[PDB]
Amino acid sequence: GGGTVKKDLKKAIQYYVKACELNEMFGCLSLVSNSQINKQKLFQYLSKACELNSGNGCRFLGDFYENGKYVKKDLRKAAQYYSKACGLNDQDGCLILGYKQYAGKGVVKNEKQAVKTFEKACRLGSEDACGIL
Numbered sequence: 001g002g003g004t005v006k007k008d009l010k011k012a013i014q015y016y017v018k019a020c021e022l023n024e025m026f027g028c029l030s031l032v033s034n035s036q037i038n039k040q041k042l043f044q045y046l047s048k049a050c051e052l053n054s055g056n057g058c059r060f061l062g063d064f065y066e067n068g069k070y071v072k073k074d075l076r077k078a079a080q081y082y083s084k085a086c087g088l089n090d091q092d093g094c095l096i097l098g099y100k101q102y103a104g105k106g107v108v109k110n111e112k113q114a115v116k117t118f119e120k121a122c123r124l125g126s127e128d129a130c131g132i133l
Contacts, residue, residue: 009036020057021049023088028056039070050081055088062096066106075106083107086117094121095129 001007012034019027031037031045043064049057062081065074079100085093094117100107101114121129 006036009034013037017045017049020045021052021054023049023054023056028054028060032060039064043070050084053088055085055090055093058082058085058088059090059093059096062093075100077106079106086120089124091121091124091126094118094124095126097121098129098132 012030013036016027016030016034020031021027028046028049031042037045043061046057046061046064050061058081062078062085064071065078065081067073079097082093082097082100086097097107098114098117098121099105101110101117103109115133118129118132122133
C-alpha cells in the first residue's frame, strides 16, 4: 500500500498545485487528471491558482461552473473565469470565450466581439480559432 500508483499520485499533489499556481505548462491539467484529488480540493486549488492570476487555473475553474456537477451551474460565472483566463493570455480561455460570445451562453450574444476574441485566441496559437476565422 505504500508504493502503489495512488501513493505516488498523492505525492505529486503539492507539486502540481505549485505548477498550476505558476501557470507552468500542463500544471493545472495534471491536477485535473490526478484521481487522488477529490473535486472539492480541486475547486479549492484552481480557485487559489486563478486568484494568483494563473491563466490555466481560471480556465479550468471556469469548467466547474459551466458544467454544474460539483457546484451549481452558473454560465455567467463560468464566462467570467474564461474571460479572466483569456485576459491572462490563456489560449483555451479565449477560444472557449469566443464560442460563448457567439452563442450568448452565460454572456450577451455578440458575434462581433466573438470574432475579436477568436482573433486573439488564434494569435495565442489556437489553430481551431484560426480556422474558424
